[PDB]
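Supplementary material to the annual report.
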Amino acid sequence: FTPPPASLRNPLIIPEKIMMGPGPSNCSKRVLTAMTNTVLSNFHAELFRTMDEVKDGLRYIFQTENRATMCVSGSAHAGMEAMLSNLLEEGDRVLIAVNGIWAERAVEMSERYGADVRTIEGPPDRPFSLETLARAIELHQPKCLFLTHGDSSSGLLQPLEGVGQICHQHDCLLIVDAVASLCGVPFYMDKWEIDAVYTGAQKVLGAPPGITPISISPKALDVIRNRRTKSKVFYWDLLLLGNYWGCYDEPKRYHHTVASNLIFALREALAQIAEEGLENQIKRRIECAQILYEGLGKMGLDIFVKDPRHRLPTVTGIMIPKGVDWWKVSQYAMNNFSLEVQGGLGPTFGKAWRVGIMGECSTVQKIQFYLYGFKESLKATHPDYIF
Amino acid sequence: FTPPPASLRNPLIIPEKIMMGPGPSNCSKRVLTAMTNTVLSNFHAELFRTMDEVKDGLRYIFQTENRATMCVSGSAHAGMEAMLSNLLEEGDRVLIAVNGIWAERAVEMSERYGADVRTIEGPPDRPFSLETLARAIELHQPKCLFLTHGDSSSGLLQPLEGVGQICHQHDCLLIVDAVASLCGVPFYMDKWEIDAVYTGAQKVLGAPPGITPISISPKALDVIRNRRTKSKVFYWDLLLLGNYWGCYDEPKRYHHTVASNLIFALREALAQIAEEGLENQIKRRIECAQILYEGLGKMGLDIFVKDPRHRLPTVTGIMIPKGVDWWKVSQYAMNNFSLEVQGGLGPTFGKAWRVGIMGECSTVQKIQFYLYGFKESLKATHPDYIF
Ligand SMILES: *Cc1c(COP(=O)(O)O)cnc(C)c1O
Ligand SMILES: *Cc1c(COP(=O)(O)O)cnc(C)c1O
Ligand SMILES: Nc1ccccc1C(=O)CCC(=O)O
Ligand SMILES: Nc1ccccc1C(=O)CCC(=O)O
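Predicted assembly:
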């Protein structure tokens, strides 16, 4: 036996940080400690009980009644992978509206799954219009439309009202990525006639990463039932996964081992948002964004999505002013305040920082602190910047 | 906003259990509390530091020097998915030796990935001989051979010495599933000339489920670099994943958010097995299995793998005696001793219970307790059984 590594001899030390990037967010002490519960057998009654509480929690936050509501055992990417491998067969047409990094990933996945990918470009800072989409649908007769709802690479919030209805008219499924919007802005899976949605644990909910709530409509469920070939990935085949999640009128069968610890944590995160109520949580985040916009204005700082009406409240791009080294600000923030001041991604790469109003930092005091430590970080770091 | 569900208003209560099924196992308190550390950003220095300690710990337990050692973000199935999607292109020939449920799952996955699947059948209670495998390889000229090492559905341990060498002669990769064997029996990834291996967190290691250590050889890594088409699943594309895990001479790029909390837990589980040392851990499990076998004999009870030389120490099938209701015994064990007495799977389904010697229950006292509460459960539940 070639010797054990020395690096494992020190204890593990992870410092506390104020996670105000657009992910992952701070989880409440209650959510974090729920993770320390006993890992359960796939068929223990108490896991099933907890899994049911989660499905309820998910129906509340997605605002759906979908029986096929469950979690994929993976990060939000795996919700994306799941929607695409379940809903498309080789040669199917999928329409992706691309104006952010996520829609590009979707493009990358659909290609791999052997779908015939149709895209429309858009400015990273301006939503696609109802008509733009409608036109693209008629034009391509797709099986699915994929839309990013809240785009954490830009700060862009894509309106959704009416979009599904159009898709339905052209026999198309609406798939929406709500990873960065859910619990940050109104969302109505059912009213907005949306067929397949996913969020992420570690964004607005303030749950730990590695598990991804999803939901599909009876309509979508049926498209899967009627595939001519098995979907490509067994691990997130939704007939099989849905089965173990008790979404169908079938006895549950072992599929794969779920991450009990992550499921406990997610349950508590949903319990938190239930006790306070969706509406208040969304309100709280809107108000925090307002305070954020004011404080940024007052520093003569620019926001990537210029037009306020288009802004996702939970992620804001702050434009690096002309003279400034963005990374130097962040190091200062981290070292002096333990403040997470996140760089850019895709559209915002090298052009803005990104601030998240998520999880435990969605409070007035938390936004103030951010403003304070951000400013102090800029000031100490670029002494010639003018406010 | 349609009302919050009532189920979420009670506190979460998860009882302590003695988890002596063949998974998941009991995690030490240290491992469990590591999960309560701060969720880190994908680019925090301290996540990368931890990720490296993990890779070192993996090389130790796998006994490899592979640079391409990392984790998939999903349960062990996802490691299986990963090997198969990365190493196979449409039409490639894969040889799977099938004699347990896991090899069946590998069949299911390979079919979905559009491989041309070749199998050989074997009795669930007897390993595949070197000659049987060698003959099958010549016959089928496969690209990959898949073997289950330790089968948790039977308790069968498949010898591996010599297998890789044969595959190499015929230009074939050796893929091994070590989910149930690693840290329970000697395992030498490099000496045994194996090209791709995975284990699971929640089996022998005593780590929480949801993250899957894997390793690939330079030989396998190269097969992936030379594919004519992108692998079907972006999420566990190993060139991409390995990049983020800093397995290659490339700057790290964002791939997906990994599960910091599960990674913290795994790090501590590897630290634990490092401090005690492989050899000692394996010895402790062999002794425990011995005590198990004796006590089971003393009760007149039969083991599914009849020949002791073929047994996997970490999972033992206990045959249900003629008169007996297996589930009634299990309920009694749980209700009266908080003792997990798991039923069957695949080959053992309805035929046997399954006991695991894994994680925090790999001690002599724990085995004795199991024997005690098992016997008392049988006795109280089937008063006419004879010892
Ligand atoms: C227990 C076990 C598994 C289970 O996979 P999960 O996805 O973790 O449930 C897979 N392979 C083997 C050999 C096992 O023993
Ligand atoms: C943050 C985010 C992701 C990230 O996915 P992970 O796999 O959780 O890293 C995906 N989609 C959207 C819209 C996001 O905001
Ligand atoms: N917990 C479980 C509950 C039901 C079915 C399976 C499991 C497993 O953990 C799979 C590993 C095995 O049983 O061999
Ligand atoms: N922490 C990160 C660091 C780098 C890139 C991505 C992340 C993410 O958390 C998820 C995507 C995002 O919102 O940026």
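Chain B touches chain A through 88 residues (CB under 8 Å).
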